[PDB]
Amino acid sequence: SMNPPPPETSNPNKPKRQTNQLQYLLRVVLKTLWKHQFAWPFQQPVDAVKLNLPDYYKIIKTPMDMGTIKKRLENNYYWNAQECIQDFNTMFTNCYIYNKPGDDIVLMAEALEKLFLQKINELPT
Ligand SMILES: CC[C@@H](C)N1c2ccccc2C(=O)N(C)c2cnc(Nc3ccc(C(=O)N4CCC(N5CCN(C)CC5)CC4)cc3OC)nc21
């Protein structure tokens, strides 16, 4: 099988806006994770063809990755910050679903998730 098309990063039917919380998610939260040592598996959609994972998209039907999130933020795709936080949590949960506890990539996702929640907590009022 082919790869699925990636998640949409624009949608002409979906109202858009920019907010201070969404700007923080791009300029601080995404930027911090993108530069982390463990970012690389998460910087683009899972290419199940290149990785020889014919079952990846049989198991994971809601894919998400930080390349998509970065484009959504840059495109002002979202209406609110909780939509973007949900995309990060989908990405982490997909990794935990497909893989097993203690696997290398699961420990990498757990480190990124810990840092993610720290950066969210730091959002100034
Ligand atoms: C361990 C689970 C890891 C495979 N993994 C998974 C494998 C099986 C099943 C599930 C997963 C999984 O859940 N996720 C999130 C993955 C997503 N994307 C990828 N993509 C990549 C894989 C290899 C390379 C790849 O061949 N390379 C060359 C050397 C580079 N290194 C970067 C860091 N520096 C220090 C050394 C060179 C980068 C790594 C590059 C990749 O995407 C860019 N892999 C995932």
From Swiss-Prot:
Residues 17-123 form the Bromo domain. Changing D104G: Found in a patient with a neurodevelopmental syndrome; uncertain significance. It is found in: Nucleus; Chromosome. Phosphorylation by CK2 disrupt the intramolecular binding between the bromo domain 2 and the NPS region and promotes binding between the NPS and the BID regions, leading to activate the protein and promote binding to acetylated histones. In absence of phosphorylation, BRD4 does not localize to p53/TP53 target gene promoters, phosphorylation promoting recruitment to p53/TP53 target promoters. There is a cross-link at K58 (Glycyl lysine isopeptide (Lys-Gly) (interchain with G-Cter in SUMO2)). Ubiquitously expressed. It comes from the Eukaryota. The record marks N99 as: Acetylated histone binding. JQ1, a thieno-triazolo-1,4-diazepine derivative, and I-BET, a benzodiazepine derivative, have been tested on tumors with success. Treatment with GSK1210151A (I-BET151, a I-BET derivative) has strong effets on mixed lineage leukemia and promotes myeloid differentiation and leukemia stem-cell depletion. Chromatin reader protein that recognizes and binds acetylated histones and plays a key role in transmission of epigenetic memory across cell divisions and transcription regulation. Remains associated with acetylated chromatin throughout the entire cell cycle and provides epigenetic memory for postmitotic G1 gene transcription by preserving acetylated chromatin status and maintaining high-order chromatin structure. During interphase, plays a key role in regulating the transcription of signal-inducible genes by associating with the P-TEFb complex and recruiting it to promoters. It is linked to Cornelia de Lange syndrome 6: A form of Cornelia de Lange syndrome, a clinically heterogeneous developmental disorder associated with malformations affecting multiple systems. It is characterized by facial dysmorphisms, abnormal hands and feet, growth delay, cognitive retardation, hirsutism, gastroesophageal dysfunction and cardiac, ophthalmologic and genitourinary anomalies. CDLS6 inheritance is autosomal dominant. A chromosomal aberration involving BRD4 is found in a rare, aggressive, and lethal carcinoma arising in midline organs of young people. Translocation t(15;19)(q14;p13) with NUTM1 which produces a BRD4-NUTM1 fusion protein. The NET domain mediates interaction with a number of chromatin proteins involved in transcription regulation (NSD3, JMJD6, CHD4, GLTSCR1 and ATAD5). Interacts with p53/TP53; the interaction is direct. Interacts (via CTD region) with CDK9 and CCNT1, acting as an associated component of P-TEFb complex. Interacts with RELA (when acetylated at 'Lys-310'). Interacts (via NET domain) with NSD3, CHD4, BICRA and ATAD5. The interaction with BICRA bridges BRD4 to the GBAF complex. Interacts (via NET domain) with JMJD6 (via JmjC and N-terminal domains); the interaction is stronger in presence of ssRNA and recruits JMJD6 on distal enhancers. Interacts with NSD3. Interacts with NIPBL. Belongs to the BET family. This is Bromodomain-containing protein 4. The lineage of its organism: Eukaryota, Metazoa, Chordata, Craniata, Vertebrata. The chain holds residues 44 to 166 of 1362 of the full protein.
